[PDB]
Structure 1
Amino acid sequence: VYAWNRKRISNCVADYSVLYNLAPFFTFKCYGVSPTKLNDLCFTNVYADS
C-alpha cells in the first residue's frame, strides 16, 4: 500500500475470461459495472494496479 504498481494496457483484444479461472475465491465484485456485460465492451485505457 506504499507503492502503486500502476500499469495501463495498450490496444488489444482483452478477453475477460482468464480472471475466471484465477486463484481461489476469484470474486468479480464491481462498483458501477457488471461482469456479465464487462466483456462485450471496448475501453479507452484500462489502468491496472496491484
Structure 2
Amino acid sequence: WNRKRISNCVADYSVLYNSASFSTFKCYGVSPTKLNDLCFTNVYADSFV
C-alpha cells in the first residue's frame, strides 16, 4: 500500500464531495463535521485497492 506524505496544505473541506461519491466515510477520533475546523500535525495518506 502506498503511503504519501502531505504537508504545506490548505486541506479543503470535509468529505471532498467534488465529483467522487464516497461509499464509506467513517472517522475515528474526529467527527466528520469538525474536520474542516482543525489543523493536523502529521498527515499520511495510505492508498490501495
Over the residues paired in the alignment, what is the CA RMSD in angstroms? 2.0
Secondary structure (helix, strand or coil) at the match of 2:45 reads: strand
Aligned residue pairs total: 47
TM-score, scaled relative to structure 1: 0.69
Secondary structure (helix, strand or coil) at the match of 1:13 reads: coil
26 and 10 in structure 1: CA distance in 2 versus 1, 3 angstrom threshold: same
TM-score, scaled relative to structure 2: 0.70
For residues 1-49 of structure 1, what are the alpha-carbon distances to aligned partners after superposition, in whole Å with 9 as ceiling and x for unaligned? xxx2000101110002562235334332112211100111001121001
9 and 25 in structure 1: CA distance in 2 versus 1, 3 angstrom threshold: closer
C-alpha distance in structure 1 between counterparts of 2:24 and 2:10, whole Å:
22
1:27 aligned residue: 24
Q: Which runs of 5+ in 2 are unaligned?
A: none
Find the structure with the greater CA-based Rg.
1
